[PDB]
Amino acid sequence: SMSVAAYESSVHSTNVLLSLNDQRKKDVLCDVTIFVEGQRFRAHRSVLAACSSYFHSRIVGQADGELNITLPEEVTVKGFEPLIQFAYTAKLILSKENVDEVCKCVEFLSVHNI
């Protein structure tokens, strides 16, 4: 009976991000490897660029093929793992044990929205 309907979903963005997290965890449809202290992390260059000024600058311009990025020794796995989890889930867990390294890694990567 209506001429126009404009709908919004409050959960769709959350569902997409959690789908992307599942892909990351399964290493399915990923397109960049991040090396942190030599350890391998798979991700999507689109998401990394969306969440970090540092990654954005190392990703825009690069070949469309497989991309490998090595982070320097300032970034530790202890500081990076909580932040890649935040990027893909919107949840950040800090402990007294990891807070100094996560802080360091946030500064280094300039993660948006802390």
Add this chain to the structure above:
Amino acid sequence: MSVAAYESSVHSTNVLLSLNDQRKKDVLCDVTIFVEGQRFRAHRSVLAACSSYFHSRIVGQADGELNITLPEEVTVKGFEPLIQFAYTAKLILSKENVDEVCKCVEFLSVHNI
């Protein structure tokens, strides 16, 4: 405090809007969709996340650029509102486009609807 667990209510929305900006600018995209001859750029990860049809045509494919042509039953009139929904969480229907959008929803099996 020994432990702090934070959640952001706006982060997923911010990420999706960043991905939409990349789509619109054709930056960091990795798949081209052809619909009624018209070209749309997107991210295979997002398309697979939002559509069972796309998921089936994406998983297993070569790592390089991927081109997917949708058959003549999918129209631009019906697809454009859905690709916008996939990337923005907003769906606009009109009397003019509702039949085609419905058809394309059936064809693609777009989730969260």
